[PDB]
Structure 1
Amino acid sequence: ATKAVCVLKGDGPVQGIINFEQKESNGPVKVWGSIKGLTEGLHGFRVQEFGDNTAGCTSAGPHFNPLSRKHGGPKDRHVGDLGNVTADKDGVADVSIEDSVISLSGDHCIIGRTLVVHEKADDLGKGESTKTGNAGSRLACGVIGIAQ
């Protein structure tokens, strides 16, 4: 099985570790971990095209969107649209997602790209909505790396 990991870091309190696992190339990717330092409530969660962090999250580039589609929800979407995570009253968000569109191999591979958590909720393109989901600024991010 292929595994990956990402350390999310920002310019404030926001930080997290997110794990990825995919049993088969054609199968779903399991995404799990936690993010702290967040405002209570919903936060956009997505993969950007580039794993360029030379300017923090500002350099992560466009949304990961190989098929040139409109922004949407994970169940609708760009390959990078992973929906929302929810933070509790202590600012801690549990991440537990199973997604069949991202991958750890092939054209939808996200290894080497940037994972980002956003300031606001991603409207899933149901609101700029069909672009960035109106999720606001990038709070923290990291490059997705190969793991064991």
Structure 2
Amino acid sequence: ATKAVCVLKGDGPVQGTIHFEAKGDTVVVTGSITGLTEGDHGFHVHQFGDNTQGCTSAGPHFNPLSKKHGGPKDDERHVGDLGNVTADKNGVAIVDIVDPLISLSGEYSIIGRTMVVHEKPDDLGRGGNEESTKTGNAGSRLACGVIGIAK
């Protein structure tokens, strides 16, 4: 798989479409998310592609190397830690990320897992409580979708 896509849906107004592309040795993630409150929102890949209980059944961050939570540029981070996306005053967040830990096949594959956008900013593992080291204190799951193979 070279291309993947995710449609984000939740119980409120947040929605969006995220695209993933294997380019060279990396993955580029692009798209946009609407309906958000202004400012930063944690944006992560969660382990299970299980939407039977809404976004809750996606489980925790995808973490095959068993590390602590961090920001996308840290060495100590989960594979699913893609940092924050930033919404403007209209509620629109434009997504543009290149990441060196995920991709689309093999052990690090995110195909069949869940993309989640969160209520609050991800503090990138530096909030100083235990929760920070798991979720970055990013709060509740506003919208999510299973990552699928695209044409």
Instruction: For residue 87 of structure 1, report the CA deviation from its aligned partner.
Output: 0.1
Which residue is equivalent to 1:23?
A: 23
Which residue is equivalent to 1:5?
A: 5
**What is the TM-score normalised by the length of structure 2?**
0.95
Which residue is equivalent to 2:53?
A: 55
One-letter amino acid of the structure 1 residue matched with residue 146 of structure 2: V
Q: Does 1:139 align with 2:142?
A: yes
Cα displacement string for residues 53-102 of structure 1 (whole angstroms, at most 9, x for unaligned residues):
01110110121000100100001000000000000000000000000100
Aligned residue pairs: how many? 146
Is the helix fraction higher in 1 or 2?
Answer: 2
Tell me how large the CA RMSD over aligned residues is.
Answer: 0.8
SS in 1 for 2:135: coil
Q: Does 1:112 align with 2:115?
A: no
- Alpha-carbon distance between aligned partners in 1 of 2:28 and 2:11, rounded to the nearest angstrom: 28
Runs (4+) of structure 1 exceeding 6 A deviation are: none
**What is the TM-score normalised by the length of structure 1?**
0.97
Instruction: For residue 28 of structure 1, report the CA deviation from its aligned partner.
Output: 1.2
Cα displacement string for residues 91-118 of structure 1 (whole angstroms, at most 9, x for unaligned residues):
0000000001001011110000000000
- Alpha-carbon distance between aligned partners in 1 of 2:94 and 2:56, rounded to the nearest angstrom: 25
Structure 1, unaligned runs of 5 or more: none
